Nucleic acid binder design. Sequence first.
RNA 1: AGGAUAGUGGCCUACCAUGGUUUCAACGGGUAACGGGGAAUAAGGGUUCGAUUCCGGAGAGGGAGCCUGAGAAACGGCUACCACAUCCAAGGAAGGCAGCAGGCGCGCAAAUUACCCAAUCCCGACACGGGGAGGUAGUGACAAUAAAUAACGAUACAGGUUGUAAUUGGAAUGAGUACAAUGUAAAUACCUUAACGAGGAACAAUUGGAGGGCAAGUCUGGUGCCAGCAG
Lengths: 58, 132, 143, 178
Amino acid sequence: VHGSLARAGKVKSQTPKVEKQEKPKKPQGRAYMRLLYTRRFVNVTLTNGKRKMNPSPA
Amino acid sequence: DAVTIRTRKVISNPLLARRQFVIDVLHPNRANVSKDELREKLAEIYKAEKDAVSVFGFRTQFGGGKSTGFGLIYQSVADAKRFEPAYRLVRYGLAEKVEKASRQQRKQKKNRDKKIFGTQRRAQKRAARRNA
Amino acid sequence: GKGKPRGLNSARKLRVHRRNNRWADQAYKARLLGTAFKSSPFGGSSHAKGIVLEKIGIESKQPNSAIRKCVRVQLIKNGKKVTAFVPNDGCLNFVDENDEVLLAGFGRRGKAKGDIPGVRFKVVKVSGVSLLALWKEKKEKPR
Amino acid sequence: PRAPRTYSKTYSVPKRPYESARLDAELKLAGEYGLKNKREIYRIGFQLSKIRRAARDLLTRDEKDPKRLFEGNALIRRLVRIGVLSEDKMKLDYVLALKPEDFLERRLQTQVFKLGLARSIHHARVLITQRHIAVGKQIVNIPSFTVRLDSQKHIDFAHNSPYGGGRAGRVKRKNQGK
RNA sequence: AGGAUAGUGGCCUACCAUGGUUUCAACGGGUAACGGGGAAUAAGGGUUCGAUUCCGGAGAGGGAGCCUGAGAAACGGCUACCACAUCCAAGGAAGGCAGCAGGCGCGCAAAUUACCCAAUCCCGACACGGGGAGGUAGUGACAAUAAAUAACGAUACAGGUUGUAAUUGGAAUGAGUACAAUGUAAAUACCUUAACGAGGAACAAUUGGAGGGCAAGUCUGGUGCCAGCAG
Ligand SMILES: CN[C@@H]1[C@@H](O)[C@@H](O[C@@H]2[C@@H](O)[C@H](O[C@H]3O[C@H]([C@@H](C)O)[C@@H](O)[C@H](O)[C@H]3N)[C@@H](N)C[C@H]2N)OC[C@]1(C)O
């Protein structure tokens, strides 16, 4: 079980192609700071002392 | 609309037989007036002629309105012509922008006269006779 | 005590002793021997251009098992032959024999990086365009 | 040729990029003063830091010392004038207690927010940027414009403002007519 | 002791003496070496850099030799050789961009053959002439300063006096295009300003990351020690 120069680009080539999703733009600048400041100190979602900022949907 | 002229730092300048001061316009609801307009108002205020008044360098404060500048009140058209440069006079009309060629053209001509000794007529007629 | 001279008039001994012993410091010795200027493939620069001589696949070191996609390159400035490495899955196919690539080090200051045996440089551009753009198709290879 | 122009930098990034405590505190400051980014926090840190280096050195000196008295009193007065320090704190030892929460109060964004000119501090920033504010008889468009005590009294809508007397603006002049 | 120099001096000559430097590193070799004021980092002590805005030196392809002149061993002066190189009717003639701009080459690596003496100062017989010195524009994400990409209200909602998840409206604005003045040697640009200039305000922010160091997922497909990532 070896490789060689022939198999170059294999996985990126055979990756099923999925386009990016149209979605609302996010604010750029001090409004983005507004958004972060609320989500972290105004609409805080504290879970018994475990604050997760990218919790998986489960 | 309610244009005002305000002066500070006045120097009486007899050596150039003129007078140096700083000029402020207090104009609201307006961009700014032309320099010539300040010349007519300066004339009416100080009962001097238009051609004895010269102003330059006008800049406005942040937020519009007030502008500063610098002006000269001479005591004749003769004086304002003796102590003044050509560009201000071309601005007003007290002179004319002389119709010289470009700087490259003038320099190239002057270098082209460096290849002839003596009068141009002599070389011209000489070359004409030798080109017969 | 302490094995160094302490006398008020011992400055020459201390200065010369320090001068002798800095030669054991690899950075200082490289700088004062001029090794980067006289023996480095790039001659001491940050980047260098070259011509591709071939393609080569190098077996990675243990405990990994892969084939790293590398090119044999001869530099324009001095004709030295160096092995460079092309990042980003699907970019050995962007380089061909007798193409002009722009190279740079791996960030380890003349040492090998990772599991790749005996390779010191990474390809940055090919035929005047960067591999990052060709990988992301922001630009296409001019031929 | 002509002599060089002197210039300098006004901030310094932290040595440790990812400190949870420091990052959280900086986000809190940005939210409490409606700042654009951390460099504005960085600038306060930098300028207060050089103030405290000089002022610490002064406090390490002796009283009645001309270097000490002269420079310390100059610093104290330049601090009291802007509203960083108050009336009863001309001692040179209260300056060390100063905080980035102090220097950030004096900004025109915060001041416009605090005296009813805006519905939110974000509104205050967009009013200053969109040129609706005036400090005394000088119109100011810089949010970080520091207001002393003298210009504390003299903040109002622009003399020619849509909110201060004058033609309203494009959306009005395009909608009210119909 | 003389000669030469503007003048001292082995600067050179004649005669004479045998001296002069060195482990406190002479002499020789290297320098990807013009020196300094300075620069970067900096608890302190240090380390590293300084071709380059000012001062000092040196050079004008390489070498040498001179004229003129108070002053040059001058190169936008001459003379000669070497190397390059232009024209030629083949007899001859003419050169020196490490000035400004521009080309070729070199390379990882650097901009227009633009306008002007209005400021700065310089030169001349000169108040007036000349100045690519210099100043103004073009290219200019080298660095540095300030600083937009949004905001405010209402419905039922949601929630323990507001901090609330969406879509309903009134407004505000400069990015930009452009009457006009200003700015300027003339301009341009800034600053000031008629008529214009936003709901997906599509006038749509990027670069890197999400195992640890180190801030941020054990979500879904693909592959299957391959392809790739990884300081
Ligand atoms: C070839 N590598 C050499 C290594 O041999 C050694 O060099 C020493 C050198 O340091 C000594 O010499 C040293 O010390 C003496 C001291 C006695 O005063 C100094 O006078 C001298 O200047 C200094 N270089 C010299 N005497 C012998 C070399 N082999 O260390 C320096 C080095 C460059 O790494």
